[PDB]
Amino acid sequence: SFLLSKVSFVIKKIRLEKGMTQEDLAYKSNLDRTYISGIERNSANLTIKSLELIMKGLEVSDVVFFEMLIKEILKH
Amino acid sequence: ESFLLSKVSFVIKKIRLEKGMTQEDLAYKSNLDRTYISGIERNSANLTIKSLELIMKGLEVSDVVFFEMLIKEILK
């Protein structure tokens, strides 16, 4: 899936840009490290509530996240 | 429901009504249950990214269009 891969990519990109490991983001959001690893491989079951929490943890606003996402969708 | 949650629900229903589609129409076109559509439009907490992909495919709305509308609603 095109959208799933781009969501996964943007979450990994923002996490790596904040210098956070998957563990770091998990600890900040009270999620497991394997949930973050999992979403970066396949974002199918990531919910909007979990994405809001992740965006909170990455200290990215929702608008910037979606701007980043539109950019990735359009690059393709 | 947070404001991101509410706005995702709002934008789905906004586009659905602009498309002249009922909930049942969206359910048919997305291959999701009408109960689930009903629920998302009230509260998007448990909407997954795959279900959002199928909702956009059933509304026949470009993903970029959906996220641009979402950014505009978040900013209002």
Numbering used by the authors:
A (entry chain A): 3 to 78
B (entry chain B): 2 to 77
Anything the authors wrote about it?
The most widespread of these mechanisms employs a “controller” (C) protein encoded by a gene downstream of its own promoter, and usually co-transcribed with the endonuclease (R) gene as a single transcriptional unit. The C-protein binds at various sites within the C/R promoter to regulate transcription of its own gene and the associated endonuclease gene. Unusually, in the RM system Esp1396I, the C-protein also represses the MTase (M) gene by binding to the promoter at the transcriptional start site, denoted OM where the C/R genes and the M gene are transcribed convergently from different promoters. Flexibility in this loop is very important for DNA sequence recognition, as it has been observed in the nucleoprotein structures to adopt different conformations depending on which operator site the protein is bound to.
The KD for the R46A mutant was ∼30 fold greater than that of the wild type, showing a much weaker interaction with the OM operator site, and consistent with a key DNA-binding role for this arginine side chain. The movement of the Cα of residue R46 between loop conformations I and III is ∼6 Å, resulting in an even larger movement of the R46 side chain. Five of the monomers in the asymmetric unit are observed to be in loop conformation I but the sixth more closely resembles that of conformation II, which is almost identical to that in the DNA-protein complex with the 19OM operator site.
